[model samples]
Target chain A: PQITLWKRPLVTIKIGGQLKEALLDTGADDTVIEEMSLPGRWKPKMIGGIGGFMKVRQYDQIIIEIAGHKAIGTVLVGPTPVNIIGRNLLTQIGATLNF
Target chain B: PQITLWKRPLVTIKIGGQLKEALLDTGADDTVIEEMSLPGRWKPKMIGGIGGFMKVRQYDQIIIEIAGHKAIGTVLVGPTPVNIIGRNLLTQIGATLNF
Candidate 1:
């Protein structure tokens, strides 16, 4: 009959690779990588969503370190306008956002 | 006046490093970065949105290359639910999505 909610300081990060610093955003439930950042050796996988629409056909896994903390997750591979951090990632580290 | 609507092949990218491929999303008005991605060495600026609520305090700049094209921009560094691809970057490349 009661509801409870908790919030923590929103963590910000800078993404770098072939170019140094690339993107900045808050942490989410899942950690996502941009396809442009992928290395050549990784393999691509064909995946479908709820509607059975062929979602991401190729992808790879990467490690994300937050505030000196690190974890590994899968990232969709393609040419997207930007990179995103999703909810699936937050659950793994027992983290939450403040604002 | 009729509003001209244009779309291009949605580009997906894979982000790697500490992690692999991460997310897949259509391009948007502006490219966003998460606070978790910053690697220190950069300074953040305080930005205010339309309502002047001081939307974000600190942020960093990064280069985002799409479809073999690259550009430099500032990203809001903070904890967010997800990363977003905004329209600002889309217009620069003269590209449209097919979907």
Candidate 2:
């Protein structure tokens, strides 16, 4: 499906039964959400990007819904300035860049 | 075209006749480049993100090539931590957050 790139491609997504407005960040490899207590268990992980690095909890096999499209993948819960929708779920939704 | 998101989803982009690697960031509002001497008139602008806000020189009517895709738009040049391909050029390239 075609998604518009506004000033900021913000999208609403449901993760772990909670709704979040995240940035549609194609630049990011994985989906990152703000610090939260997630169900189940997670592995300790660290991620780095333009804004330095941060430690996170990697929850395996998490279900997320983005703009009505559902995708199951690994989600990282951490102290992120903003929530992000990365290629992981973006691909699952069959999203592509359009003019 | 479907783009696979690697751990980082880094891509090669051509700008000002020089080739450079840049991040495909859907979260960013505009494309930002490291401090470079752009051969065009520009206006002083400021942008804010997760890390912090930075002053930049906004260049208009510049041509950029990303993965053989050509696009013209505003590019902010400054001392950015990373070179990012934001929605401005990403839209012309038809880039979407894909898996």
Candidate 3:
């Protein structure tokens, strides 16, 4: 699928049997999902973005279906403005930027 | 050009005769360049992001050459961790997300 930039490139993702909308962010170095509970051992981490830094829980090897593409990677659970699908998962899904 | 998500998609952008690097961010709604003095009449504004809101100066009709493609739009100047080329400019250059 090719998504134009005319609007926010929000896409549907299936994680833990729940459907969610996320932004495919090329600028973000890692994927971040808003505060939610996931079954896994996670490490405490702080990530910085456009505004400032916030503490997050890093869950590893989580399976997520992004835009119908299967991807397994790390997912950070934190207080993010929106759900963001970053480079880590984008690579797994073979997502690319075209101009 | 098609860029894989294996690495951070940093690209060279020529703005105001100064060459700088910016991340092509689909998650971000608008373009945000780190604080720099540009010749223009701008308005004081505020924008919110991942962490929180911040003060910014909005400069309209600015010319930016992104990845050899020319784009003219509003560029926000403020304190940011990195320079971001968001959907506003990405749309002008016909950038899209492909998988």
* Candidate number with greatest lDDT: 3
lDDT of 2: 0.79
lDDT of 3 by residue, B1-99 (tens): 998888789999998888999999888888999888877899998898777887999999999999899989999999986889999999999899998
Docking quality tier of model 2? acceptable
Per-model B-chain TM-score = 0.44, 0.91, 0.96
Per-prediction DockQ comes to 0.02, 0.43, 0.89
Worst 10 residues of 3 chain B by lDDT: B45-54
Candidate 2: stretches off by over 4 Å: B2-11, B40-57, B79-82, B93-99
lDDT of 2 by residue, A27-60 (tens): 7778899988778988998886654467889998
Each prediction's TM-score against the native? Answer: 0.30, 0.78, 0.97
Residue B7 C-alpha lDDT in model 1? 18
Each prediction's total of clashing residue pairs, residues at least 3 apart in sequence or on different chains, is 65, 8, 0
Task: Tell me the spans in candidate 1 whose CA falls farther than 4 Å from its real position.
Answer: A1-31, A40-61, A97-99, B1-99
Per-residue lDDT of B1-99 in model 1, one digit per residue for the tens?
A: 111122112344322222222122222223444545544455544432211222332343455554444545544544333444444444444433220
Better of 2 and 3 by lDDT: 3
> The CA-based lDDT of model 1 is what?
0.36
TM-score of 1: 0.30
Instruction: Give me the displacement of residue A24 in model 3, in angstroms.
Output: 0.8
lDDT of each: 0.36, 0.79, 0.90
Question: Evaluated with TM-score, which candidate comes out highest?
Answer: 3
